Amino acid sequence: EVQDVNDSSWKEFVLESEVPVMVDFWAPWCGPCKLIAPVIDELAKEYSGKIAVYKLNTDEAPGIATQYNIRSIPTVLFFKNGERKESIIGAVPKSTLTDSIEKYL
């Protein structure tokens, strides 16, 4: 399923997480977004208890996109200890996301 995060739950779900966080930025109008949705869901289950994963619809939470200067999607952001550690744009393969995840673990 992957939990949704927005402007109001951001600080609590992402910035105060005790574990590395992977956030998927998407929007209904973006075709390529449908292509990584399966990978994000699979990785979330696959790494339960090890990392937190959320999805952020830019249509409904532009504030967050503005704070981190996100101007394009699909975008995947990684957070750790309250700090943004890396940003990836495009249709990212499951393998590349796994290297990054494994790095913050």
Side-chain angles (χ1 to χ4, degrees), residues 36-86:
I36 68 169
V39 181
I40 305 297
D41 288 343
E42 172 62 11
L43 280 173
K45 310 182 186 184
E46 202 168 292
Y47 282 88
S48 296
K50 293 181 183 63
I51 68 164
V53 180
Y54 307 90
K55 286 182 180 180
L56 182 143
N57 179 343
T58 58
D59 281 4
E60 298 295 348
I64 303 300
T66 297
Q67 177 183 345
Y68 299 98
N69 200 21
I70 308 301
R71 305 179 183 198
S72 303
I73 57 170
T75 283
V76 173
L77 248 51
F78 288 88
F79 284 85
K80 192 178 185 185
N81 306 311
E83 304 182 302
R84 174 186 172 184
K85 293 299 179 63
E86 161 176 36

Side-chain angles (χ1 to χ4, degrees), residues 18-40:
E18 298 284 59
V19 98
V21 186
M22 184 190 263
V23 183
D24 175 18
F25 283 70
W26 72 289
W29 53 264
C30 191
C33 284
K34 302 183 182 61
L35 240 48
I36 68 169
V39 181
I40 305 297

Side-chain angles (χ1 to χ4, degrees), residues 1 7-10 14 20 23 29 32 47 51-52 56 67 70 104-105:
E1 283 291 307
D7 300 355
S8 297
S9 56
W10 187 261
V14 178
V23 183
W29 53 264
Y47 282 88
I51 68 164
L56 182 143
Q67 177 183 345
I70 308 301
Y104 301 115
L105 284 186

